[PDB]
């Protein structure tokens, strides 16, 4: 079933939690949940489009120059994405900054374009890209929410100005009247949170295996 | 199961070493506690008790034997963190520092003997980064039973809860004051002539941390530790010599901008870090040349970030950097074996 | 340089002895000292072989041979 890939890529093979890929945007643009959600959505869109293009162009890539071709097929698309969200989502573009342009070198994107998109049809590749993007977005949302709560208390902030007023319902506040721990926002707060998330994933995987046993 | 030798052992133990280190720290801690009054006592007690409780909880979680709580490895960390904090600091600063050290810095790596970074300095850096306002408020010396220091319940309201410290009970120290007055286009000489006395600063009559103030009782404790074979003289000697040499050279080159020698030695937590904190066995080289390199690096980094950096004191940062650099020093400066050259090849005769 | 083996099931013995080139099985066994290890060895009665083939006492032996005394 084609839907197997979409569910399998969520937790069994996570880009940032299992394969140890896409760590730069995971650790950099995570100080707010909205930043993580926007980066995840952009990465998912780029992954879907690049996977579809590569699979449609599968039987045309020379074996020895495979990278500089496919990288181009990614790079230009990424450029377009920038030239989209710099024009109609400028508030989010100013926040992400360099890492919206740094999706060409995203290890997850090229890894999925090479490993799966060169030996699968267009529909399975699209579903695999969607699953990887969804998993990356979930990880980004979780880490951003944890860091934002530890640093300021609020969960999701300035979503109306960034993602549009339509998402205004997402602005919730946790721990009212809280100055927050400043270290969570800072770079030292990202590695520790990611390590704790990895440890929690290992613990829940072991407990789930025991329950299945 | 058969027993393996040897069947003889000296009179040594981790408990004795840790308790002797605490005994060496005792006189300077008493001098600090008496000088600043009740709030310092409250903060020190809270920090030590919280460190012990968190260590017990972490030992319970990991399943390690509770006897590990009786070796004094947690009480020493709490003691050093408490004497590193500002005197009239709130309780939550000490509790959070103890939680961040005993916890992430030590017990998250396995326990005693496994951590690669100094726990007390890790907690100090984390507290300074997270809460800069509470970690840059120094109380002037208000001696216990001096008719001007706050009473018992007034000190309780100062430490616990959030009663303001009023006015006239908080001032600037030496290093920060010198840097600020340098930013006020005043040369380095006039600042020290009318705002710094070496004799009073050496005794410990200046504002600062809880136990950092006195540079003489700490020296006595360090010397006593050295005579007891508990620490090695290489690290303290190297740190002090490097700081003094660099400071004296800078003073000689440009006396109107650099202050060096006695001013650098009798200011900040240089002596305490050199004797009791940079000599951490688990996070220091096990060789002799390694210890010399560790001390030289600590001294150079301390002086460089003191003078040209953005901090009035960087003993914790230098210690953390050298703890990071320690494994390479250990793996590249191993002692020579018997019957082999430095490269390890067998000798020829 | 040869070896002498006693195939006694109770205690399988094997010894290595250096002998002069062109020697005989009799002199090789005498030099090897297997007689003193087991006084119940009859060199005229029990079978003497090389690598599993019955041989003669004064037959010449080469380097790397294996004399064996068995029932």
């Amino acid at each position: 079933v084609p839907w197997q890939y979409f569910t399998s890529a969520l937790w069994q093979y996570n880009v940032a939690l299992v394969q140890m890929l896409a760590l730069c945007p995971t650790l950099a643009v995570t100080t707010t949940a909205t930043n993580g959600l926007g980066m995840g959505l952009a990465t998912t869109l780029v992954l879907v489009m690049t996977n579809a293009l590569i699979s449609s162009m599968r039987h045309t890539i020379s074996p020895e120059v495979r990278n500089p071709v496919m990288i181009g097929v990614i790079a230009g698309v990424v450029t377009l994405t920038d030239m989209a969200m710099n024009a109609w989502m400028h508030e989010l573009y100013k926040v992400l900054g360099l890492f919206i342009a740094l999706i060409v070198t995203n290890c997850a994107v090229l890894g999925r374009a090479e490993s799966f998109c060169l030996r699968n049809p267009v529909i399975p590749s699209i579903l695999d890209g969607a699953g990887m993007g969804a998993g990356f977005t979930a990880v980004l949302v979780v880490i951003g929410g944890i860091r934002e709560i530890l640093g300021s208390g609020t969960l999701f902030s300035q979503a109306s100005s960034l993602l549009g007023s339509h998402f205004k319902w997402m602005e919730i506040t946790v721990i009212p009247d809280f100055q927050g721990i400043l270290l969570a926002i800072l770079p030292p707060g990202a590695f520790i949170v990611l390590g704790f998330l990895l440890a929690a994933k290992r613990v829940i995987d072991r407990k789930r295996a025991e329950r299945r046993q | 199961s058969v027993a393996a030798g040897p069947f003889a052992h000296d009179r040594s133990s981790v408990n004795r070493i840790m308790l002797d280190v605490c005994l060496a720290l005792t006189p300077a801690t008493l001098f600090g506690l008496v000088m600043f009054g009740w709030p310092a006592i409250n903060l020190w007690l809270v920090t030590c008790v919280s460190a012990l409780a968190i260590e017990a909880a972490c030992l319970r979680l990991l399943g390690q034997p509770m006897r590990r709580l009786l070796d004094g490895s947690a009480l020493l960390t709490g003691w050093l963190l408490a004497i590193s904090l500002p005197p009239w600091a709130p309780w939550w600063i000490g509790v959070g520092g103890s939680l961040f050290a005993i916890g992430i810095g030590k017990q998250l790596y396995g326990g005693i003997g496994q951590n690669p970074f100094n726990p007390a300095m890790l907690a100090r850096v984390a507290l300074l980064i997270a809460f800069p306002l509470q970690m840059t408020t120094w109380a002037l010396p208000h001696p216990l039973f001096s008719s001007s220091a706050p009473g018992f319940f007034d000190s309780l309201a100062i430490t616990f809860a959030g009663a303001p410290l009023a006015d006239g009970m908080t001032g600037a120290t030496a290093l920060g004051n010198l840097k600020t007055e340098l930013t006020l286009n005043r040369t380095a000489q006039e600042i020290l002539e009318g705002g710094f006395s070496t004799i009073s600063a050496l005794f410990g009559s200046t504002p600062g941390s809880l136990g950092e103030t006195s540079e003489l009782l700490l020296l006595v404790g360090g010397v006593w530790l050295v005579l007891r074979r508990i620490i090695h003289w290489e690290i303290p000697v190297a740190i002090l010599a490097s700081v003094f040499v660099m400071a004296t050279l800078a003073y000689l080159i440009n006396p109107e901008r650099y202050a060096g020698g006695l001013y650098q030695l009798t200011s900040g937590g240089l002596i305490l870090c050199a004797f009791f904190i940079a000599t951490d066995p688990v996070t220091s080289p096990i060789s002799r040349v390694g210890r010399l390199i560790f001390g030289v690096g600590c001294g150079v980094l301390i002086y460089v970030i003191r003078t040209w950096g953005s901090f009035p004191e960087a003993a914790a940062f230098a210690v953390l950097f050298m703890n990071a650099l320690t494994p390479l020093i250990d793996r590249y400066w191993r002692p020579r074996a018997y019957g082999r050259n430095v490269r390890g090849k067998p000798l020829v005769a | 340089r040869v070896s002498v083996v006693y195939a006694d099931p109770a205690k399988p013995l094997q010894l290595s002895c250096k002998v002069e080139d062109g020697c005989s099985v009799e002199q090789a066994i005498q030099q090897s000292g297997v007689l003193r290890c087991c006084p119940d060895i009859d060199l005229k009665k029990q079978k003497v072989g090389v690598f599993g083939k019955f041989v003669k006492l004064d037959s010449p032996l080469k380097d790397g041979d294996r004399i064996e005394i068995y029932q």
Binding site: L21, V65, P68, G111, S115 | - | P9, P12, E68
Partner: protein, 113 residues
């Protein structure tokens, strides 16, 4: 336009260079990977009738003996490959695990710290 021509020139130059280099001269995760009881024979005193089948099927020089009623016995060179098990019509070979002796004694690892 003057820009697409230059980009195409750069592209074809790079491609031809790569091709000529290949003539004359995956994934990140997989590339990281590249960068980074014995038994012995046993012969009883009755099941061996000197049928010399065990020596016949024993590539190692383990069984010593020939003829009949000589009670061939193994040596230390046995490996338990079993070439002599089915060889004997009377099922004489009695492969057993090696017994612990003084010369094969090693110290035990300390429990824990």
């Amino acid at each position: 336009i003057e820009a697409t021509l230059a980009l195409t020139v750069m592209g074809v130059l790079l491609g031809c260079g790569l091709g000529l280099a290949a003539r004359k001269f995956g994934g990140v995760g997989l590339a990281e990977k590249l960068a980074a009881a014995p038994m012995l024979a046993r012969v009883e005193a009755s099941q061996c009738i000197g049928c010399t089948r065990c020596y016949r099927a024993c590539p190692t020089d383990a069984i010593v003996g020939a003829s009949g009623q000589v009670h061939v016995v193994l040596e230390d060179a046995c490996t338990g490959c079993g070439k002599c098990r089915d060889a004997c019509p009377e099922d004489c070979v009695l492969l057993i695990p090696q017994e612990q002796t003084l010369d094969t004694w090693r110290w035990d690892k300390p429990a824990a710290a």
